[PDB]
Amino acid sequence: ICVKVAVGAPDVLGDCPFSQRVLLTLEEKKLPYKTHLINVSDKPQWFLDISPEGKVPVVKLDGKWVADSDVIVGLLEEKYPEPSLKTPPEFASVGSKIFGAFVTFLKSKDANDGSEKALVDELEALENHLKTHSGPFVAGEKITAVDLSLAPKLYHLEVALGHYKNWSVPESLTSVRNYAKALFSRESFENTKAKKEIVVAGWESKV
Length: 207
Ligand SMILES: N[C@@H](CCC(=O)N[C@@H](CS)C(=O)NCC(=O)O)C(=O)O
Description:
The protein has helices at 10-13, 17-28, 45-50, 69-79, 98-107, 115-132, 145-165, 174-184, 187-190, 196-202; strands at residues 3-8, 33-38, 58-61, 64-67. The chain is of the alpha+beta class. A 4-stranded mixed beta sheet has the order 2-1-3-4. Helix 2 packs across helix 7 (145-165) and helix 6 packs across helix 8. The longest helix has 21 residues, at 145-165. Glutathione binds next to helix 4. GO terms for molecular function: glutathione binding; glutathione dehydrogenase (ascorbate) activity; glutathione transferase activity. Belongs to the GST superfamily. DHAR family. It comes from Arabidopsis thaliana (Mouse-ear cress). Residues 6-79 form the GST N-terminal domain.
């Protein structure tokens, strides 16, 4: 068994945290996979045929192409249940606004707009959960789907805000920092992350 994954070429689309979420899921389930790069920044109709919104990642499972990383990891969970990555529904929303807050802050040219505070507000909510719930991960001792969704977002956050704004996560958010190190140090992450240079380049137009 070998899962086909369509991701963006680093030169044309950058690094995608939603693609790395899928790849992490395959790694953690030890599912073999082959990565096919999509060279196009445009949307040729054969690509919109496999992916209605013209987005990566897309995955080929059971001879059919399926887009959307939320759908993809859920379908991989149903097809390959061991090891289980099911996140208990009550933790599904943990960290959910962080990535969006980071993009606004990264984009912002007005240091007075409140974007930085909005991001710290979301990081603090993650910190509250991690300090008051057994770790290392959001749901406990075992890694689950919510952790593989957050990890590439935390990675892009730290890399991109460190380069474009020499901004780092506040030192007082020690649980968040231990959480990211625990995720970044995993074999699945080291084998699916992009060079910092790719991350930085992917975001240059937005800054
Ligand atoms: N909700 C989708 C989001 C996927 C997504 O937005 N991918 C971006 C790259 S990070 C993309 O393909 N953008 C294509 C474009 O419109 O340029 C998912 O989880 O897979």
